[PDB]
Amino acid sequence: GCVLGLVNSSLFVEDCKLPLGQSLCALPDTPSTMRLAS
Amino acid sequence: IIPGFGGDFNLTLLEPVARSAIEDLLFDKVTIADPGYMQGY
């Protein structure tokens, strides 16, 4: 977490995120292998 | 765009290095009561 508060996602710090549906202040990476990213 | 882009024109929109000096100033002048994110609790 730390980009908004706490999250439950296991994966973190993905290199980059393209514009995506849903999302947060820092959109997370696609869960389909989840992934807070940036 | 670099600090010396104006050269003879003291444009203060030079990015200080992202949030250029004038963005700085005006956003500073005003007063915002919003709490900082990630620290509200």
CB contact under 8 A, A2 and B38: yes
**Would you state the structure tokens that stand for residue B31, as one six-digit string?**
């007063």
**How does B7-36 read in b/e, with b if 16+ C-beta sit within 10 Å?**
eeeeeeebeeeeeeeeeeeeeeeeeeeeee
H/E run at residue B25: helix B21-29
How distant is the Cα of A4 from the closest Cα of chain B, in angstroms? Answer: 5
Rounded CA gap, A4 and A34, in Å?
A: 16
CB contact under 8 A, A4 and B41: no
Experimental technique behind these coordinates: cryo-EM
Rounded CA gap, B39 and A25, in Å?
A: 15
CB contact under 8 A, B38 and A25: no
Residues of B in contact with A25 (CB under 8 A): 37
Q: Which resolution, in Å, applies to this structure?
A: 2.8
Rounded CA gap, B38 and A13, in Å?
A: 17
The answer to whether the beta carbons of residues A28 and A17 sit under 8 Å apart is: yes
For chain A, list the strands marked E by DSSP: none
Helix residue spans in chain B (DSSP H): 21-29
